């Protein structure tokens, strides 16, 4: 037999990096004193059609995450004033911790939240998150309620990603976008199910 089944394996079928979100931040002008924008996004796969649809083939799952960040920037007005190099703080808030609510706040200080400091113009930043969960596997479908006479189908908690620019305001407003590329790793699945059609999918098992 000169044909192998090694390209349909679970790792081959799933472990591929795809963009999951685009987070916008900016460093405003030092003249106008409006608040500096910061980005917050909760980790969830229910916004990428392809990854979700490939996950709904099964009901129980386990995997680690590999996250990469691609940062780009641009001036947003025709001014001769320029800016120096920029450094970005990319904070990962594990599942269960408070989320930032203002750009300057103790949440960008806690020793518990691990951060990355990335200087513009260098190789993209990368990290790996392990399997974080209280059960022995994620559950895409859950026939249960939180309270019995309450939500019908548990939701999975992965963490949060917050992003800001460490530099203080320049005299020039510069806007930046960070694209997050996620890659599941060491994945295992259980109990296959029939796949759903492309009907925009849905928030739950509702249709």
């Amino acid at each position: 037999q000169h044909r192998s089944r090694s390209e349909s394996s679970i790792e081959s079928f799933f472990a591929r990096g795809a963009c999951v979100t685009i987070m916008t931040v900016d460093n405003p002008a030092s003249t106008t004193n409006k608040d500096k924008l910061f980005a917050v996004w909760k980790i969830t796969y229910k916004d990428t059609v392809q990854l979700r649809r490939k996950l709904e083939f099964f009901t129980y799952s386990r995997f680690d995450m590999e996250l990469t960040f691609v940062v780009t920037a641009n001036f947003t007005e025709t001014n001769n004033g320029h800016a120096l190099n920029q450094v970005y703080q990319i904070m990962y808030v594990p599942p269960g911790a408070p989320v930032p609510e203002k750009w300057d706040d103790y949440t960008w200080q806690t020793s518990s939240n691990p951060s990355i400091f990335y200087t513009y113009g260098t190789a993209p930043a990368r990290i790996s998150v392990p399997y974080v969960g209280i059960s022995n596997a994620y559950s895409h479908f859950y026939d249960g309620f939180s309270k019995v006479p309450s939500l019908y189908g548990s939701l999975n908690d992965f963490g949060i990603l917050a992003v800001r620019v460490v530099n203080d305001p320049n005299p020039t407003k510069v806007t930046s976008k960070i694209r997050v590329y996620l890659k599941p790793k060491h994945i295992r699945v259980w109990c296959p199910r029939p796949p759903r059609a492309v009907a925009y999918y849905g928030p739950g098992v509702d249709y």
Partner: protein
């Protein structure tokens, strides 16, 4: 925690024809055409699918997936001209090693007519289907009073 053994039987004569499919869906999250705790738990009375209250869609199995693919789930076929009994031995399936039974339903059992019922003239116009469930390897912890 516990497993189950389900035995389905159909009483039919040699002049009846039709086919049934029995499917054992793990974590059978259903949906109607909009749920509450009253809909997902109808009790021993059970519920009924429907075609084109809370009544999922038969050809979608109530969860948006086509009926034809439903054979990925553990299943059996009762063809009246070959056999009229089916048996499924369901082990315990859950992400946790043990869980609260009062809030969580491990399995769902669905019975769907693949080929409608027909019979010779003047026969019995409707035949009975019986379910018999036996728990296996049960065990409980955290005993309260009463």
């Amino acid at each position: 925690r516990s497993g189950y053994t389900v035995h389905v039987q159909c009483n039919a004569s040699k002049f009846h024809q039709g086919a049934l499919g029995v499917f054992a869906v793990p974590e059978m999250c259903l949906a109607g055409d909009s749920t509450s705790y009253q809909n997902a738990n109808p009790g021993e009375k059970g519920g009924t699918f429907t075609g084109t209250r809370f009544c999922p869609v038969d050809y979608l199995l109530g969860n948006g997936t086509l009926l034809g693919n439903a054979f990925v789930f553990p299943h059996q076929i009762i063809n009246l001209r070959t056999n009229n009994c089916a048996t499924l031995v369901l082990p315990y399936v859950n992400s946790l090693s043990i869980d609260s039974m009062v809030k969580h339903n491990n399995w769902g059992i669905a019975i769907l007519p693949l080929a409608p019922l027909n019979f010779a003239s003047e026969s019995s116009p409707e035949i009975p289907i019986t379910l018999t469930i036996a728990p296996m390897c049960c065990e409980f912890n955290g005993l309260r009073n009463i």
